[PDB]
Amino acid sequence: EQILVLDPPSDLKFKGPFTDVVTTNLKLQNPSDRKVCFKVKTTAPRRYCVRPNSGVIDPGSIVTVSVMLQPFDYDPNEKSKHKFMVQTIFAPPSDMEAVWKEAKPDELMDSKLRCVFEM
Amino acid sequence: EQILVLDPPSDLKFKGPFTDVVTTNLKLQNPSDRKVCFKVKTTAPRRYCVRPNSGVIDPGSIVTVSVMLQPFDYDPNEKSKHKFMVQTIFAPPSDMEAVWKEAKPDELMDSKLRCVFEM
């Protein structure tokens, strides 16, 4: 199960107009006694900038991730199909590449969030 | 060790000018008696389109991946730092997401290629 606590836990809302970049924030809280590594993935990678898109969260700490929806012609009739995934693993004791490739599938935790466009 | 055979095996060369998209091809041959899954990764994801960026290669078969360098202001004095990784796994018996998340790091094979810009 996911160790991190996400606010919002499951739907990311974005408020228009969308003639400019619209940011929504994702709070990642680590309530646990261990460092936790995270990486953000999306079903629509061209459509968003995510900053940071990965990192490490110290025990007890919180990191707020900025999710930047790129501008587009908004169809108030089309409901978003976009999703995000926050993948996590407890931090091992140099390199973050090496960390993800070494990770056993049993170690990995995911949260998924659905995006929602409101006007 | 990498099961697929790559032509080219290690450097991908891109010929200018670069005021338009420039493609180079990567041949992925499966000499083995088993299906093989592949995914392509890059150090410079905004700079390239890769088609297909993943797939499955039947035993005996060959797939040619198109690597499309996006247009840019070329500095003949800057040498490219870009790299690609072709990650592979033998094919298991519905869904490719499920396939990558279930992969044990011991199962995974990578090839790395260096990009090279020539005029």
Binding site: K39, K41, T43, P45, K83 | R46, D95, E97
Partner: peptide, 9 residues
């Protein structure tokens, strides 16, 4: 169904 890619920054 849904294919997840690494988010860009």
């Amino acid at each position: 169904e849904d294919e997840f890619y690494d988010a860009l920054s």
